[PDB]
Design an enzyme around this catalytic site. Structure first.
Site, PDB file in Angstrom:
ATOM      1  N   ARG A   1       0.805  -1.230   0.000  1.00 27.11           N
ATOM      2  CA  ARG A   1       0.000   0.000   0.000  1.00 27.11           C
ATOM      3  C   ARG A   1       0.838   1.281   0.000  1.00 27.11           C
ATOM      4  O   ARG A   1       0.434   2.302  -0.561  1.00 27.11           O
ATOM      5  CB  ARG A   1      -0.953   0.019   1.203  1.00 27.11           C
ATOM      6  CG  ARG A   1      -0.254  -0.024   2.557  1.00 27.11           C
ATOM      7  CD  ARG A   1      -1.178   0.335   3.709  1.00 27.11           C
ATOM      8  NE  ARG A   1      -0.487   0.218   4.994  1.00 27.11           N
ATOM      9  CZ  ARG A   1       0.176   1.205   5.591  1.00 27.11           C
ATOM     10  NH1 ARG A   1       0.241   2.407   5.034  1.00 27.11           N
ATOM     11  NH2 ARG A   1       0.770   0.991   6.754  1.00 27.11           N
TER      12      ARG A   1
ATOM     13  N   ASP B   1       8.295   3.291   0.755  1.00 27.52           N
ATOM     14  CA  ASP B   1       9.485   4.119   0.899  1.00 27.52           C
ATOM     15  C   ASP B   1      10.542   3.564  -0.050  1.00 27.52           C
ATOM     16  O   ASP B   1      11.270   2.628   0.291  1.00 27.52           O
ATOM     17  CB  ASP B   1       9.981   4.097   2.349  1.00 27.52           C
ATOM     18  CG  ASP B   1      11.238   4.936   2.561  1.00 27.52           C
ATOM     19  OD1 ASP B   1      11.856   5.384   1.570  1.00 27.52           O
ATOM     20  OD2 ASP B   1      11.614   5.147   3.733  1.00 27.52           O
TER      21      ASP B   1
HETATM   22  C1  LIG Z   1      11.057  -2.473   4.479  1.00 27.74           C
HETATM   23  C2  LIG Z   1      11.098  -2.814   5.720  1.00 27.74           C
HETATM   24  C3  LIG Z   1      11.195  -3.315   7.096  1.00 27.74           C
HETATM   25  N1  LIG Z   1      11.429  -2.166   7.954  1.00 27.74           N
HETATM   26  C4  LIG Z   1      10.391  -1.772   8.894  1.00 27.74           C
HETATM   27  C5  LIG Z   1      10.039  -0.335   8.613  1.00 27.74           C
HETATM   28  C6  LIG Z   1       9.139   0.339   9.436  1.00 27.74           C
HETATM   29  C7  LIG Z   1       8.800   1.669   9.199  1.00 27.74           C
HETATM   30  C8  LIG Z   1       9.372   2.335   8.125  1.00 27.74           C
HETATM   31  N2  LIG Z   1       9.087   3.612   7.844  1.00 27.74           N
HETATM   32  C9  LIG Z   1       9.649   4.247   6.800  1.00 27.74           C
HETATM   33  N3  LIG Z   1       9.318   5.536   6.567  1.00 27.74           N
HETATM   34  N4  LIG Z   1      10.530   3.646   5.960  1.00 27.74           N
HETATM   35  C10 LIG Z   1      10.909   2.362   6.121  1.00 27.74           C
HETATM   36  O1  LIG Z   1      11.722   1.820   5.341  1.00 27.74           O
HETATM   37  C11 LIG Z   1      10.324   1.615   7.257  1.00 27.74           C
HETATM   38  C12 LIG Z   1      10.635   0.292   7.525  1.00 27.74           C
HETATM   39  C13 LIG Z   1      12.625  -1.434   7.868  1.00 27.74           C
HETATM   40  C14 LIG Z   1      12.857  -0.370   8.734  1.00 27.74           C
HETATM   41  C15 LIG Z   1      14.042   0.354   8.650  1.00 27.74           C
HETATM   42  C16 LIG Z   1      15.002   0.025   7.699  1.00 27.74           C
HETATM   43  C17 LIG Z   1      16.282   0.808   7.609  1.00 27.74           C
HETATM   44  O2  LIG Z   1      16.572   1.607   8.486  1.00 27.74           O
HETATM   45  N5  LIG Z   1      17.077   0.604   6.565  1.00 27.74           N
HETATM   46  C18 LIG Z   1      18.136  -0.380   6.616  1.00 27.74           C
HETATM   47  C19 LIG Z   1      18.658  -0.674   5.214  1.00 27.74           C
HETATM   48  C20 LIG Z   1      17.978  -1.915   4.647  1.00 27.74           C
HETATM   49  C21 LIG Z   1      17.917  -1.837   3.139  1.00 27.74           C
HETATM   50  O3  LIG Z   1      18.980  -1.956   2.496  1.00 27.74           O
HETATM   51  O4  LIG Z   1      16.805  -1.663   2.592  1.00 27.74           O
HETATM   52  C22 LIG Z   1      19.253   0.098   7.487  1.00 27.74           C
HETATM   53  O5  LIG Z   1      20.386   0.231   6.979  1.00 27.74           O
HETATM   54  O6  LIG Z   1      19.002   0.346   8.686  1.00 27.74           O
HETATM   55  C23 LIG Z   1      14.768  -1.036   6.831  1.00 27.74           C
HETATM   56  C24 LIG Z   1      13.584  -1.763   6.915  1.00 27.74           C
HETATM   57  O1  LIG Z   2       7.903  -3.034   4.581  1.00 33.48           O
HETATM   58  C1  LIG Z   2       7.804  -1.791   4.645  1.00 33.48           C
HETATM   59  C2  LIG Z   2       7.508  -1.181   5.860  1.00 33.48           C
HETATM   60  C3  LIG Z   2       7.409   0.206   5.913  1.00 33.48           C
HETATM   61  N1  LIG Z   2       7.587   0.942   4.802  1.00 33.48           N
HETATM   62  C4  LIG Z   2       7.478   2.408   4.906  1.00 33.48           C
HETATM   63  C5  LIG Z   2       6.479   3.029   3.938  1.00 33.48           C
HETATM   64  C6  LIG Z   2       5.729   4.065   4.754  1.00 33.48           C
HETATM   65  O2  LIG Z   2       6.211   5.376   4.441  1.00 33.48           O
HETATM   66  C7  LIG Z   2       6.017   3.748   6.210  1.00 33.48           C
HETATM   67  C8  LIG Z   2       4.793   3.191   6.925  1.00 33.48           C
HETATM   68  O3  LIG Z   2       3.929   4.265   7.289  1.00 33.48           O
HETATM   69  P1  LIG Z   2       2.405   4.327   6.767  1.00 33.48           P
HETATM   70  O4  LIG Z   2       2.473   3.880   5.327  1.00 33.48           O
HETATM   71  O5  LIG Z   2       1.661   3.376   7.673  1.00 33.48           O
HETATM   72  O6  LIG Z   2       2.021   5.776   6.946  1.00 33.48           O
HETATM   73  O7  LIG Z   2       7.058   2.771   6.227  1.00 33.48           O
HETATM   74  C9  LIG Z   2       7.898   0.285   3.578  1.00 33.48           C
HETATM   75  O8  LIG Z   2       8.082   0.922   2.516  1.00 33.48           O
HETATM   76  N2  LIG Z   2       7.993  -1.052   3.544  1.00 33.48           N
END
Ligand SMILES: C#CCN(Cc1ccc2[nH]c(N)nc(=O)c2c1)c1ccc(C(=O)N[C@@H](CCC(=O)O)C(=O)O)cc1
Ligand SMILES: O=c1ccn([C@H]2C[C@H](O)[C@@H](COP(=O)(O)O)O2)c(=O)[nH]1
Ligand SMILES: NC(=O)C1=CN([C@@H]2O[C@H](COP(=O)(O)OP(=O)(O)OC[C@H]3O[C@@H](n4cnc5c(N)ncnc54)[C@H](OP(=O)(O)O)[C@@H]3O)[C@@H](O)[C@H]2O)C=CC1
Ligand SMILES: NC(=O)C1=CN([C@@H]2O[C@H](COP(=O)(O)OP(=O)(O)OC[C@H]3O[C@@H](n4cnc5c(N)ncnc54)[C@H](OP(=O)(O)O)[C@@H]3O)[C@@H](O)[C@H]2O)C=CC1
Ligand SMILES: C#CCN(Cc1ccc2[nH]c(N)nc(=O)c2c1)c1ccc(C(=O)N[C@@H](CCC(=O)O)C(=O)O)cc1
Ligand SMILES: COc1ncc(-c2cccc(N3CCN(c4cnc(N)nc4N)CC3)c2)cn1
Ligand SMILES: COc1ncc(-c2cccc(N3CCN(c4cnc(N)nc4N)CC3)c2)cn1
Ligand SMILES: O=c1ccn([C@H]2C[C@H](O)[C@@H](COP(=O)(O)O)O2)c(=O)[nH]1
Lengths: 511, 511
Positions: free
Chosen positions: A411, A414
């Site tokens: 849905r 990022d």
């Molecule tokens: C997707 C997902 C699961 N998740 C859970 C999760 C929860 C909320 C989020 N919110 C937002 N805004 N972006 C995200 O990517 C995100 C991801 C992740 C959360 C953080 C990272 C992160 O900080 N980046 C890693 C790099 C990993 C990569 O190469 O992609 C790092 O270096 O810390 C990755 C995944």
């Molecule tokens: O697997 C994931 C988990 C999180 N997000 C990012 C996208 C959104 O910006 C944020 C979640 O916030 P909402 O979409 O719920 O607002 O984390 C991802 O792209 N992939």
């Protein structure tokens, strides 16, 4: 104007014990065979090689048919090669020259009308000599992703950043990732850079009346990562500036699609190192139906911490949640859909609908069924979750050849941060599921809703788009025999093979 | 020597009424016309040729047409009748008067060679009749006005007028997407009379490079329906033959996408007539959260009856379900997700999650929210359903400019029968929601899982592909003021304007 054609490890290794350092690479040889032969009528090509290279060939394949074989050698005589095997009728006899400058002179003298393209085939002696004289207009390089023990090496050159991290050579072509004998590789070419429709046209001209690209130079872009890169560039070029829940500005596009092959290699993106330890530990976490983020945090995986903090759980209107609890989240809905959640500690065995087990039992007994779906979206318990699922739905599919594909709908995306993590995570699930069901992995398809790059990430992403992808790695499931059901996988059951990414890019997680 | 014809046209071939245009002002058309008649590749300009009444119907500030040599065919009008009508500007070309079109073409060769680039017959019926008779017409620039208007003057009948409505040849080489001005849909077609710089990249493209095409002549494919036609063509050519839960042979594919604009016209597909009475009645059935198929069955929509029969209800292992009861069907989850089902007669108001309410509210208040989703898929409730939902999820997205976009994911897609219905069914919801939230409709995005054609349609589909699409219609919401909630809508509040589809093809429903 000559061309070089090579197969090459990341550390530029090409040979050992006068032989190839790798097991046979059938798709590399086919590619070699085609490049060295093909022509747009009256002209054959020329294959210039060293003695050691000529000798290392099997007797069966030498001389290389349909091509003028030239060997650069002092010690070998023109008749010893003639006495080695009787010549078949219809081919130029193999020619021997003193050095490489003398070797091309031979073509200037005797073959000026017959030959079309000139190919230097090996080895380090002729390659070094070719780059010295700078007469190489193009380099056809097969980048072997795996490292192998080598004693003979291809000389380093300006713009060899396409192999590993550190007159010029720029890539103009990058193919998709191929694999043979558990060895991943791809093909690149590099350039020495330093009124049937006249009627239609004006209708098109008025019809328009209305900035950033990924790796401009690269014109033929076979590499599958180009999807992701062009997807970044597109949102930067054509997206819409938006506000957010987070408070950080967003540039977003709606409705986005990517698909990646699973049969040859694994789409672990190369333009920035992907935290694979994360995608693995988090997926196993999901499969367990674990909702405790501390179990992740302790393992060195801090990806969920900020969204399970004491501060965040209270803003998310759940003061009675323990720090670390993701609520009835991703994995819980997979393994116990609809069950009454209590805390991360409560045992939810047998309760709810185990979507994952049913998706497999369906795949294993009746693979044509169109109800092979696993959802994480439960409108009944959305508020109890610390954060609603992004990747909320996935469907599975089997074809004739017992090959397995997987669609995943997300849905909110990022692109900078979450997306490459998400690609690799579900592609891994496809490999796991495929094995348990006795199916070949085929393809993973990524369906996206709100597809956005954060404004604070924008500077870092232009940096990422200057980087041309490296060949994908192979992920191998180990102990294939020991694992029989989806819950039998452990962290140590996997092996990432030949993953040579570009250096780490730091990007802040939007809280 | 060859001439081009440039006309706008009612489906009944109508071009004029009361010595004027039949429709309200179409800006995009007049733009097209201006550019097509004017644009020229140096020392050269274009000739426009018209009848006396065309010249008269035209507003005074626009005649003569600037930068174009005007020629009027008349025997009452003389050359000095026009000169006295308006002072000639310096630089422009004088209007010439000929007594017939052969004299017009003769004058063009006699005096105006080396002078005039391209010749355009511009009107009216007389000159269009004349030009078609002579066979001098190489290209027809038709602006198909989709709406039927009062007309007293008509474009003459010609071989190839099957692009207008139902029935030396004129076949389409160009079909654009549907535009709209002043509640009037239209599109542009062009017809044709028939009766080592980068070459070093190409050798690797040789080996990597490798049956049914729809409307293959049409070189330009603007019309958004081409998406669906090519989707049928791809499945047939590149799909894998599976067996089916019903037993009937299936050609299927995984992960294919379509997107349709909603800002100009409505994607009610034209290549075969879509049962719009059904799409409307079925959606308002869902919106009411109705699970009783007899309410559809009594209204003349029998699309659910073959799935609520005593035989099918029992084969789905539901002996106590009354005839008509879809169980917790799509409508049910939308408004009462998670509610415990009894029968179709029980009143469920207040029970479960009202996803649709939550969607509209989040839209009208916080449009930058990314949790704006609705789902019909309920794993815990699948067993009680007569059928697991095909369309199971939709996401809503709001733009900078208050523009609504909608994604719908469909796990299983009957590309012959169900897909155009579904395109229509969600595009309609998107219109409805947009009005209820005070938003401009922009786009409908169709995401598709198991995307397939049945084998007892293959013949019936190859025929359909021979048909080129007509412009899309406009669906207007009537009684806008009275409707402020999604439940306020009734079957009467809608009007399909300018729908001109091809003949119906008989396609049986698979139970
Ligand atoms: C997707 C997902 C699961 N998740 C859970 C999760 C929860 C909320 C989020 N919110 C937002 N805004 N972006 C995200 O990517 C995100 C991801 C992740 C959360 C953080 C990272 C992160 O900080 N980046 C890693 C790099 C990993 C990569 O190469 O992609 C790092 O270096 O810390 C990755 C995944
Ligand atoms: O697997 C994931 C988990 C999180 N997000 C990012 C996208 C959104 O910006 C944020 C979640 O916030 P909402 O979409 O719920 O607002 O984390 C991802 O792209 N992939
Ligand atoms: N990865 C790949 O794409 C390929 C790898 N290989 C590998 O490379 C290795 C063989 O190459 P390598 O060991 O470098 O030996 P070379 O193929 O460079 O040949 C060495 C011999 O050829 C003569 N020679 C070569 N270059 C010149 C020159 N510029 N001028 C004069 N004489 C020259 C020399 O003879 P003299 O001593 O008499 O002067 C020398 O002894 C093998 O291990 C093989 O498997 C081979 C082909 C393709
Ligand atoms: N939507 C569209 O694309 C267009 C629509 N129109 C519409 O059509 C109407 C005008 O067209 P229409 O009514 O057909 O009148 P025309 O524009 O065809 O002009 C009629 C006059 O032109 C002369 N003429 C035309 N053809 C011939 C011929 N083959 N031989 C001899 N004389 C000829 C005659 O003039 P005389 O009697 O002086 O000899 C005749 O009286 C208007 O209502 C206008 O709005 C017009 C142009 C484009
Ligand atoms: C999708 C959907 C909803 N539904 C419900 C429904 C239920 C079971 C199904 N089963 C199968 N195999 N295919 C379907 O399309 C299908 C559709 C429909 C079912 C039938 C028709 C139908 O018979 N066709 C229309 C013609 C519409 C058109 O030309 O596109 C008709 O004239 O009745 C339409 C919609
Ligand atoms: C494992 O068995 C095996 N292994 C190897 C052979 C073989 C037989 C003839 C010739 C050769 N080479 C000729 C040149 N080469 C090359 C391969 N790809 C690229 N892109 N560039 C190259 N220059 C590899 C070396 C290799 C036979 N059998
Ligand atoms: C009500 O306002 C209004 N209404 C009408 C006009 C107008 C002004 C110039 C010219 C005209 N033509 C009538 C329409 N024509 C035409 C239009 N599209 C195509 N594809 N082919 C054409 N042959 C040609 C000439 C009409 C101005 N104003
Ligand atoms: O709204 C609908 C309803 C039905 N179908 C078609 C698609 C499938 O061919 C069939 C359902 O069969 P299963 O996927 O349930 O087996 O009905 C649709 O495409 N859309």
């Amino acid at each position: 104007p000559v061309c070089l054609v090579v197969a090459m490890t990341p550390k530029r290794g090409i040979g050992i014990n006068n032989g190839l350092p790798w097991p046979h690479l059938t798709t590399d040889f086919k590619h070699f065979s085609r490049v060295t032969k093909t022509t747009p009528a009256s002209r054959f090509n020329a294959v210039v090689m060293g003695r050691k290279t000529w000798e290392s060939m099997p007797r069966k394949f030498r001389p290389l048919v349909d091509r003028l074989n030239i060997v650069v050698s002092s010690s070998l005589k023109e008749e010893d090669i003639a006495a080695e095997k009787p010549q078949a009728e219809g081919q130029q006899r193999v020619r021997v020259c003193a050095s490489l400058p003398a070797a091309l002179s031979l073509l200037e003298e005797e073959y000026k009308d017959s030959v079309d393209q000139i190919f230097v085939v090996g080895g380090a002696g002729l390659y070094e000599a070719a780059l010295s004289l700078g007469v190489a207009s193009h380099l056809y390089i097969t980048r072997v992703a795996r490292e192998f023990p080598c004693d003979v090496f291809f000389p380093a050159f300006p713009g060899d950043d396409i192999l590993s991290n550190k007159a010029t050579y720029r890539p103009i072509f990058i193919s998709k990732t191929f694999s043979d004998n558990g060895v991943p590789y791809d093909f690149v070419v590099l350039e020495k850079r330093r009124s049937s429709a006249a009627a239609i046209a004006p209708v098109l001209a008025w019809m328009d009346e209305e900035l950033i690209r990924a790796v401009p130079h690269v014109h033929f872009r076979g590499h599958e990562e180009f999807q992701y890169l062009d997807l970044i560039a597109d949102i930067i070029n054509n997206g819409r500036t938006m506000d957010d829940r987070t408070g950080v500005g967003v540039i977003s596009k709606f409705g986005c699609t990517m698909r990646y092959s699973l049969d040859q290699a694994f789409p672990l993106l190369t333009t920035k190192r992907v935290f694979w330890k994360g995608v693995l530990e988090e997926l196993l976490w999901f499969i367990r139906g674990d909702t405790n983020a501390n179990h992740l945090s302790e393992k060195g995986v801090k990806i969920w911490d900020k969204n399970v903090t004491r501060e965040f759980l209270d803003s998310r209107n759940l003061p009675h949640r323990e720090v670390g609890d993701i609520g009835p989240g991703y994995g819980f809905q997979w393994r116990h859909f609809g069950a009454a959640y209590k805390d991360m500690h409560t045992d939810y065995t047998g309760q709810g609908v185990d979507q994952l087990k049913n998706v497999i039992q369906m795949l294993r007994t009746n693979p044509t069924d169109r109800r092979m779906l696993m959802t994480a979206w439960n409108p009944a318990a959305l508020d109890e979750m610390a954060l609603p699922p992004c990747h909320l739905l996935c469907q599975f599919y089997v074809n004739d050849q017992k090959e397995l594909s997987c669609i995943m709908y997300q849905r909110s995306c990022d692109v900078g941060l979450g997306v490459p993590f998400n690609i690799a995570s579900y592609s891994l699930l496809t490999l796991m599921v495929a094995h348990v069901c006795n199916l070949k992995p085929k393809e993973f398809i990524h369906f996206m809703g709100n597809t956005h790059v954060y404004t604070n990430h924008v500077e870092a992403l232009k940096e990422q788009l200057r980087r041309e992808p490296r060949p994908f790695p192979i992920v191998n499931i180990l102990n294939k025999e020991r694992i029989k059901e989806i819950d039998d996988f452990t962290a140590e059951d996997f092996e990432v093979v030949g993953y040579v990414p570009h250096g780490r890019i730091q990007m802040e997680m939007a809280v």
